[PDB]
Amino acid sequence: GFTDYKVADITLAAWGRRELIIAESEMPALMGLRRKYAGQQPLKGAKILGCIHMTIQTGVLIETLVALGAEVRWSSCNIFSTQDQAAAAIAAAGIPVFAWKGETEEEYEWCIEQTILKDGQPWDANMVLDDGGDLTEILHKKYPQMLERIHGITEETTTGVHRLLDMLKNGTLKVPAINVNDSVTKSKNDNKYGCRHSLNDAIKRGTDHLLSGKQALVIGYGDVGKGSSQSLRQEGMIVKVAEVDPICAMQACMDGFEVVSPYKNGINDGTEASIDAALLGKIDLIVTTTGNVNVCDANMLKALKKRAVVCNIGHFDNEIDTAFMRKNWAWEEVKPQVHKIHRTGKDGFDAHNDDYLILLAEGRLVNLGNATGHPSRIMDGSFANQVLAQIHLFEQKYADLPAAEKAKRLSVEVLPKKLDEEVALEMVKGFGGVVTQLTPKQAEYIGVSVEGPFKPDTYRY
Amino acid sequence: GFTDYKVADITLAAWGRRELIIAESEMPALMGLRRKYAGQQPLKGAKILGCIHMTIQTGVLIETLVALGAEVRWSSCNIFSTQDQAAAAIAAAGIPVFAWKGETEEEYEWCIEQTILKDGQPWDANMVLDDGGDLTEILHKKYPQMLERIHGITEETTTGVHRLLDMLKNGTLKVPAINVNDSVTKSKNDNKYGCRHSLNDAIKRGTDHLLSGKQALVIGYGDVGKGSSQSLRQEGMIVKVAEVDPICAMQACMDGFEVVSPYKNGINDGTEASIDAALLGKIDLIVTTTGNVNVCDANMLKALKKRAVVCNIGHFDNEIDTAFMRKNWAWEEVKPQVHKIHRTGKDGFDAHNDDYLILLAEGRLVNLGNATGHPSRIMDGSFANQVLAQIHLFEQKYADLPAAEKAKRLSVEVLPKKLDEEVALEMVKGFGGVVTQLTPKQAEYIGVSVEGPFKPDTYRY
Amino acid sequence: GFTDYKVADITLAAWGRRELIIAESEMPALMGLRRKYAGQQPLKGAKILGCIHMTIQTGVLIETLVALGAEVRWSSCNIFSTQDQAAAAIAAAGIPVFAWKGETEEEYEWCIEQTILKDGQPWDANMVLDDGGDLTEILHKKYPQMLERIHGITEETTTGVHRLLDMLKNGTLKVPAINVNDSVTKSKNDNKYGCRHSLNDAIKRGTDHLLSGKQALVIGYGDVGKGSSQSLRQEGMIVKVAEVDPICAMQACMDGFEVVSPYKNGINDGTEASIDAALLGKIDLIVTTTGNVNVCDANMLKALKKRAVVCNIGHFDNEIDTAFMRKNWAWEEVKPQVHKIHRTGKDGFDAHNDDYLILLAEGRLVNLGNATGHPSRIMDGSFANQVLAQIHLFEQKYADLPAAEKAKRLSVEVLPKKLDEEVALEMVKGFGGVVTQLTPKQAEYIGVSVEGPFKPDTYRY
Ligand SMILES: NC(=O)c1ccc[n+]([C@@H]2O[C@H](COP(=O)([O-])OP(=O)(O)OC[C@H]3O[C@@H](n4cnc5c(N)ncnc54)[C@H](O)[C@@H]3O)[C@@H](O)[C@H]2O)c1
Ligand SMILES: NC(=O)c1ccc[n+]([C@@H]2O[C@H](COP(=O)([O-])OP(=O)(O)OC[C@H]3O[C@@H](n4cnc5c(N)ncnc54)[C@H](O)[C@@H]3O)[C@@H](O)[C@H]2O)c1
Ligand SMILES: NC(=O)c1ccc[n+]([C@@H]2O[C@H](COP(=O)([O-])OP(=O)(O)OC[C@H]3O[C@@H](n4cnc5c(N)ncnc54)[C@H](O)[C@@H]3O)[C@@H](O)[C@H]2O)c1
Ligand SMILES: CN(Cc1cnn(C)c1)C(=O)C1CCCCC1
Ligand SMILES: CN(Cc1cnn(C)c1)C(=O)C1CCCCC1
Ligand SMILES: Nc1ncnc2[nH]cnc12
Ligand SMILES: Nc1ncnc2[nH]cnc12
Ligand SMILES: Nc1ncnc2[nH]cnc12
Ligand SMILES: [K+]
Ligand SMILES: [K+]
Ligand SMILES: [K+]
């Protein structure tokens, strides 16, 4: 008689369980943590509010936390990223989850509130796992009393970590956090290689367009932009890259990309005349990867080649001025998460009009919106870090300190390199790779221990 | 009141129609044939039996043949390759089509017969379009009288051309045929680049497996094997290649792949002792590409690494010994066209057994079975050749020739290089490419006309 | 007391012998023929005039022909392509060779004549091995009497075959020929992969320029152009391709290249107004691969980006209008085969002028001019074909047949596919590859012999 959930179709649970069993074989770091810590139950007593894409991969994470003793209440951190069969499997296992593919904004907020509230009253939560900072923001803004009992936050992604550091500098952060994003086995695995796998995957599922021989513009060349550019280049696209960071621009050049700006001489003054109309007129596909605001703006959208695809793989949809397109242009749904946007007018469209753009996932995270996000074996690294971070913060029991002691432990930290390496070793073994062991004299020669850590904390990999 | 069809769901037509309109903008050579020939109606009076994958791309082909004056009756050439919304769009257009995704073998044969028979009698067909030779075989073997009225066959694929050539060698081919496969804008575009696009696409949709860093074995290195190996290598797989043709094997070496055999010394004597158990026990993914029989045999299946993915992108499912797997091992459906094959035995399976293989599309063509096959811009090339082939054979009027002229005309031929080049030029313009025109002195220097053809018929590209 | 040679420096012979011994281990097809046929001496009595780049690789070719019983007299087919240590090692072995790096045009002609003449009068030659057709032309124009005793010509390269075909068509070809170029183990090995290896090699040796991130324009996308484009793209260049053949252009598009023309809309009208000055002013490197005339013309050279590198990897230097650059612009030698060409005028130059181009090998074959051409393991394929072609034509004894039989054998033909496959098998084995053997049933299924040939003669690979 379990009813504390809300999913699209509970009967998809058996299908979801089949895929969870497969995914478990693809996630050895996470399943190794489950085996190593199951008997010790290091999360016994933890009550975790979780807000992250309700995919099959997140399901393995959820059941790993539960296997270690935790109770959880879960929601997705995006309206399009849930895999309904994963949510169904988690609900059928008796775990409160509120998540389905294609939520409205109102339903998105309701789902988070259903994790926060149990039977109309605040749940006695004491841990937070977030991806992007929406749950974190709601707790600080609307439920500050609940944070008095919460031992910490473990934050998944770059945008969320940015919001956390903003609150820390403004003195508004109420509990300590661990930056899961900046582990090497997260940032340089998930953010880069994950988008390499899943960006062309989403574009093919949404459009079935040939990419070889076509022109792409990738806005940004951080980790997500690096992986995105590779996702397209390996398919044979001619890829151009835009950046505001000269060091990232240098890497793009050395990686074999032409570096261009959508604006003449890189200067974005807000006018149509600043747009490089000749450049945008040749682009078949534009992808935003920045985590910034309005990096594919209304003047760029007006100037893009007819029938160009437009998508975003950064965390929030405001990378693209989709508001401008809702106000001025007529939307034709091809299928879910795929819209033709007719630049001929707002009121109606000719079904055979040739002047349209194709928008994927209404400008929300395209890899999760139009495909299934990152594959299990990549998320294995990110989610082993999440499990380790949850254990660390829960065992430190920040909320039980006196007021004076909380002030001294309020911080945003990363996991130590030794744990990063141990996650990486399990990932390598999952590939069948064999790591060499240093001899004692070789370890002394480079000044490390035989068991690591093998690099100083300044090393960039 | 049109009722002459059978599809999964006629209400998918509007969705199919939206995707057809997108596909037309992706297929400029085919769409260019509509404009150049619409006024002349070169297929007026043609009644075409067509048997080929009922995809969106085949939709554009079908409606091109109809726009040039033809009547058609269509079926798919594979039980899993139909896109149900394409079939719905075609039927809703008043065009007879008998095709749905996931047919049984009996329904497959039934669908082809519904194209052959109209109102219980043979249709007065006079043209054939085939992909694989199944329709051609059924006509020769079961409706030879209909071939008295048929002017020719245009065959799409390598396996179908081989069957035509065997019939010709045996004196058992009743109408002339055009080998559409061996146009360069078909074989060196569809067969190679199409599989490059669509193989990893299908594997991702089926399993969502990370491919980077894993081991693949591609059986075959002809056109499909070349494109398949690239599909996987560009994703970061470590790809090994098997071949019986030493020329193709040389190409794989020079392309940067290790060439291996599943058998010790390359000698396939049919025994378990001949299997290189070490090699097979390291392979995460095996893909057959040969058009041959039993190239992923039972002994290889027994020796594959636990949880390896097995699929076939050749035309017929007998490239993998799936019959052996049906007889001996338990099949667990993950989802449509994805099965776990449990090697623990045939009488049931443990849901948490680790000793299984993952078979895609039940060994049927994986790109069409687990995804959508080749993209529109690639199929543009194949299907422009098909339309040109249909025009040439229909206007030749073989069925109306005297018996002496019939005997001189009974052959299997390819399209002339000029037509191949003309298709290629429209493909290049679709990419925005600009071809240079020879000066008269340059044309004289290399001994070609400024208008081409630019290569001798022996040229291999 | 052997003096019948002329080389740069005989004392380089020991060095040349060391490298020949290494190259022998890299040339298993060639050495396999040596071991297989040395007992039979099938070239006993053959007297071969040979004209092909006097490299280490040609050294192994020459000594294989001698090992099989032939006498030869040798010259290079390019003024810059000889490796002086290879020539010295051949002369030290008592083999007539006339070749050194850096010949004048007069010396080049004199060297070919020294092979034709022994003691001031025509040698009793009876076979010809040629690369590019210069020796073949001199025999037909200046020594036609010698051709009445010559049993055949074995021609290495595409341009040479073109000239042979023109002569056959005109009725001026006096002896049969084997087209060695169009063996798959030659054209699709040497012409493509050889240039992939040696083009970026020669550019680095000549300029030491970083190639990553810069813009290249490759004129042509045949076998040489395909390999040259890959040579640059794999280094990270942004590569654009020009073509007159829409089929080759299609391949360049599908291979991930942007296809452009130096002329607006591809129309070369002889005026500067037709030059796409905006495109050419972005190009850092241009490479001609066509075998055509003036594909990098004067107006192009004027519009190139300052400090661009210009080079040719086709057979003859007229692909670039270097005559224009000699007449109008000041040449500054950087080092042998590397010249700065100052576009500021003809009479001298400022040492610090910024407006110059860099010309490699004075527009002669750049891979052989500025580096060492193709590696031994690739030339293995080409030269194994040469040996088999020499054996076949010599044993046919064309010159001694009745003219009624001569008329039936006066042709330009390629080797049989079976021998093409045997050469490929030995190359694959050189890599450690293992070719799989068809079972009798599999061979039956696809219609071949277990021993091959495995493809019809129309197969393009
Ligand atoms: N979709 C996914 O699966 C996924 C995975 C990881 C992260 N993310 C999200 O993607 C975003 C980027 O993450 P990241 O790790 O790459 O961050 P990052 O800081 O490494 O990279 C962002 C880059 O954008 C550049 N940039 C900023 N403004 C720009 C502008 N106007 N024009 C061009 N370039 C500009 C920055 O210089 C920077 O290099 C974040 O929102 C993150 O949360 C998404
Ligand atoms: N799925 C698709 O979209 C698609 C597209 C085109 C063709 N096809 C089909 O794919 C198959 C192959 O087509 P193709 O054009 O590449 O033919 P191909 O002749 O060009 O190449 C097939 C290759 O398989 C090799 N081979 C044969 N038996 C072998 C064995 N026992 N082990 C290893 N290698 C072996 C042959 O040497 C040959 O090089 C045919 O059935 C064709 O109809 C499928
Ligand atoms: N340097 C080497 O090691 C090496 C090796 C092999 C061959 N070659 C020589 O290289 C040349 C090319 O050989 P190939 O086998 O590639 O011949 P090919 O016929 O395969 O390719 C030449 C290509 O140039 C294209 N072309 C012709 N005129 C053009 C123009 N004005 N603009 C653009 N493209 C144009 C043609 O369409 C053709 O595709 C020949 O001279 C050959 O003898 C050199
Ligand atoms: C047949 N024609 C006219 C033509 C072009 N060249 N020549 C000598 C005649 C076309 O344009 C087709 C070519 C293939 C598909 C699109 C349009
Ligand atoms: C090993 N092979 C090839 C073959 C035949 N069948 N299979 C499955 C493989 C043979 O033909 C031998 C068999 C015994 C002695 C003579 C020749
Ligand atoms: N598959 C996935 N599950 C959860 N979060 C993700 N972020 C990116 N891919 C993801
Ligand atoms: N999309 C497609 N439609 C028809 N035939 C195909 N063969 C391969 N892909 C195809
Ligand atoms: N190394 C080499 N030797 C002889 N001829 C060649 N042609 C291209 N490379 C060569
Ligand atoms: K996934
Ligand atoms: K498709
Ligand atoms: K060399």
From Swiss-Prot, chains A, B, C:
Keyword Cytoplasm: yes
EC class (word): hydrolase
Keywords assigned by UniProt, alphabetized: Cytoplasm, Hydrolase, NAD, One-carbon metabolism
Record InterPro entries: Adenosylhomocyst_ase-like_sf (IPR042172), Adenosylhomocysteinase-like (IPR000043), Ado_hCys_hydrolase_NAD-bd (IPR015878), NAD(P)-bd_dom_sf (IPR036291), S-Ado-L-homoCys_hydrolase_CS (IPR020082)
Gene name of this polypeptide: ahcY
Name by which UniProt lists this protein: Adenosylhomocysteinase
Places the protein is found: Cytoplasm
Catalyzed chemical reaction(s): S-adenosyl-L-homocysteine + H2O = L-homocysteine + adenosine
